[PDB]
Amino acid sequence: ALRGTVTDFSGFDGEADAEVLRKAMEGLGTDEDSILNLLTARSNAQRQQIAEEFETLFGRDLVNDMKSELTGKFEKLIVALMKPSRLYDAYELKHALKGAGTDEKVLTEIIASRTPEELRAIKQAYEEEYGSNLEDDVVGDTSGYYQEMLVVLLQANRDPDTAIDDAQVELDAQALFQAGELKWGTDEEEFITILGTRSVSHLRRVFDKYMTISGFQIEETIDTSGNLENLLLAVVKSIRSIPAYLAETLYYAMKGAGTDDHTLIRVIVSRSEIDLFNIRKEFRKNFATSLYSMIKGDTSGDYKKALLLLSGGEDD
Ligand SMILES: [Ca+2]
Ligand SMILES: [Ca+2]
Ligand SMILES: [Ca+2]
């Protein structure tokens, strides 16, 4: 059901691939086309192998060469594509942890939308790479019940789908309606436990029960909102549908004045092998154009070409 848009290339020769990229860059001048045609059509594990082979051939590090050879957004994209899947979310989290200038958007997006499995892998990749504990660094660079919600979620311990108890559904719906009357400023532990810990299917029932109880959907309570409110929205939307949430994220990365390339790159690279196909379907369903068409319009050059190759779905 969950389908990315990049898969293992058939008849893969890592050595041949290394020589293509070498021909593309050796000398003054650069063949961005050959580079982006190659790497956007190889899976991430194949890219790591291509990098290995490149080093043995040329004696040179592949990513460093592409850092000097390439420029701007296109460089940032290619270098993102070269990060191993296993470390990519751990890296984007580190990049976003900066004490005062901490990038909450990224923390929220990743933690609210990743599965239990994905979180404990991220938590392990993060300690190996950076020699510190993800939860502690998060705690040290965040505050309030935003921090609390995050730590809870980082416990990667959500309830599994079981049999539905409508009485319990009645109570939580009632508890979240009341928490929302109090503007998410009281007994925060309670609604954190409900939203951060109860099962996916339980909570989808809760959202409907809530709408009966209140007249409005739970999203309409939150949206000029704080960090904690953005997290509740991200968690709620991720509960309803992860690809929808991530389609929405892509949309706002582009809808305004310029482009939030940081987000565009991250969502495409990190989702390219999990559920980007599903993301395209939600984006078309909910925003009335292909994801392809919005990339085409908001991006240019080789950067755009690579992004469209990764994504696909022109005739969506
Ligand atoms: Ca060159
Ligand atoms: Ca980043
Ligand atoms: Ca724009």
CATH fold for domain 11-83: Annexin V; domain 1 (1.10.220)
Distance 249 CA to ligand 3 centre (A): 13
Read off the tokens for 10.
Answer: 């058939």
Distance 298 CA to ligand 3 centre (A): 6
CB within 8 A of 97, min separation 6: which ones?
107, 137, 138, 141
Distance 65 CA to ligand 1 centre (A): 9
Q: What angle do CA 106, 300, 46 make, to 5 degrees?
A: 65
φ and ψ of 98, to 5 deg: -145, 35
Count the neighbouring beta carbons within 10 Å of the beta carbon of residue 62: 22
CA gap 296, 300 in Å, rounded: 7
Distance 297 CA to ligand 1 centre (A): 29
Read off the tokens for 277.
Answer: 């196909």
Residue type, 160: P
Cα atoms in the Cβ-side hemisphere of radius 13 Å centred on 285? 12
In CATH, the number for domain 158-241 is: 1.10.220.10
Read off the tokens for 313.
Answer: 């779905």
Distance 281 CA to ligand 3 centre (A): 21
CA gap 139, 153 in Å, rounded: 13
Please name which of 207, 205, 115, 179 lies closest in space to residue 153, comparing C-alpha atoms: 115
The residue whose two tokens read 């929808």 is: 244
Distance 71 CA to ligand 3 centre (A): 21
Helices 291-298 and 301-311 pack at an angle, to 10 degrees, of 170
Does 242-313 match 84-157 at the fold level?
yes
Cα torsion at 95, 98, 102, 107 (round to 10°)? 40
The residue whose two tokens read 């809870």 is: 152
Ligand nearest to the CA of 21: 1
Distance 257 CA to ligand 2 centre (A): 21
Distance 194 CA to ligand 3 centre (A): 36
Ligand nearest to the CA of 68: 1
| CATH class name, domain 84-157 | mainly alpha
The residue whose two tokens read 């904690």 is: 228
Pair 83, 45: CB distance under 8 Å: no
CB within 8 A of 88, min separation 6: which ones?
80, 269, 270
Distance 265 CA to ligand 3 centre (A): 14
3-class DSSP string for the chain: CCCCCCCCCCCCCHHHHHHHHHHHHCCCCCCHHHHHHHHCCCCHHHHHHHHHHHHHHHCCCHHHHHHHHCCHHHHHHHHHHHCCHHHHHHHHHHHHCCHHHCCHHHHHHHHHHCCHHHHHHHHHHHHHHHCCCHHHHHHHHCCHHHHHHHHHHHCCCCCCCCCCCHHHHHHHHHHHHHHHHCCCCCCHHHHHHHHHHCCHHHHHHHHHHHHHHHCCCCHHHHCCCCHHHHHHHHHHHHHHCHHHHHHHHHHHHHHCCCCCHHHHHHHHHHHCCCCHHHHHHHHHHHHCCCHHHHHHHHCCHHHHHHHHHHHCCCCC
Pair 231, 150: CB distance under 8 Å: yes
Q: How was this structure determined?
A: X-ray
Read off the tokens for 97.
Answer: 């942890």
Ligand nearest to the CA of 109: 2
Distance of CA 314 to the CA centre of its chain: 22
Distance 25 CA to ligand 1 centre (A): 4
Q: 89: exposed, middle or buried (C-beta count within 10 Å: 0-12, 13-18, 19+)?
A: buried
Distance 109 CA to ligand 1 centre (A): 37
CA gap 106, 110 in Å, rounded: 6
Pair 307, 299: CB distance under 8 Å: yes
| CATH class name, domain 242-313 | mainly alpha
Question: For residue 88, what are the CA distances in angstroms to 8, 15, 72, 95, 294?
Answer: 19, 25, 20, 11, 25
Q: 229: exposed, middle or buried (C-beta count within 10 Å: 0-12, 13-18, 19+)?
A: middle
Pair 233, 240: CB distance under 8 Å: no
CA gap 209, 190 in Å, rounded: 18
Torsion sign across C-alpha atoms 222, 228, 232, 233: positive
Read off the tokens for 54.
Answer: 């490149």
Domain ranges of the chain: 11-83, 84-157, 158-241, 242-313
Pair 75, 67: CB distance under 8 Å: yes
